[PDB]
């Protein structure tokens, strides 16, 4: 219904965006390391729904 | 804020015609319901008519056959044609966009009809 603004920090940069997003009611980042490195953590975003 | 954009009114004599049009825009969650409102100084808000996303024309029985219904689905916007005007029908119209949450509601174009 309104604009919404949303900043997130994966491993290697920042996202800043400004849309309509249709956020759910617990907007987490599930988080998993690789089986061989560990070096860098993968993210999967589940903020918003579209 | 979903804004509606109602226009095309005005003055016309008696058997004219007349197209107002409605543009929906901002959120308008796609399974959207747009209708139109009549009320004469004096009276409530009359159904004028309904259409749905299934394409579907609903019409009251005040104006049989004289006002149609036409969608846009590349601007989901609405246009009504009005025509074979009676005086009957001065009226103020207005949207009804039923959305799927917060219903919204115009702001008005007045429909006159006399000789």
């Known amino acids: 219904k309104t604009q919404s603004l949303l900043i997130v920090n994966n491993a290697t940069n920042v996202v800043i965006k400004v849309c309509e997003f249709q956020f759910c009611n617990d907007p987490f980042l599930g988080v998993y390391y690789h089986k061989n490195n560990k070096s860098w953590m993968e993210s999967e975003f589940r903020v918003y729904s579209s | 804020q979903v804004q509606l954009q109602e226009s095309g009114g005005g003055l016309v004599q008696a058997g004219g015609s007349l197209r107002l049009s409605c543009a929906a825009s901002?959120?308008?969650?796609?399974?959207?319901?747009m209708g139109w409102f009549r009320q004469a100084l004096g009276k409530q808000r009359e159904m004028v008519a309904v259409?749905?996303?299934?394409?579907?024309?609903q019409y009251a029985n005040f104006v049989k056959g004289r006002f149609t219904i036409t969608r846009d689905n590349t601007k989901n916007t609405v246009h009504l044609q009005m025509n074979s005007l009676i005086p009957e029908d001065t009226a103020v119209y207005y949207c009804?966009?039923?959305?799927?949450?917060?219903?919204?509601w115009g702001q008005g174009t007045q429909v006159t009809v006399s000789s």
């Open positions: 901002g959120s308008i969650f796609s399974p959207n319901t």
């Open positions: 259409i749905s996303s299934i394409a579907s024309t």
């Open positions: 009804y966009a039923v959305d799927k949450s917060q219903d919204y």
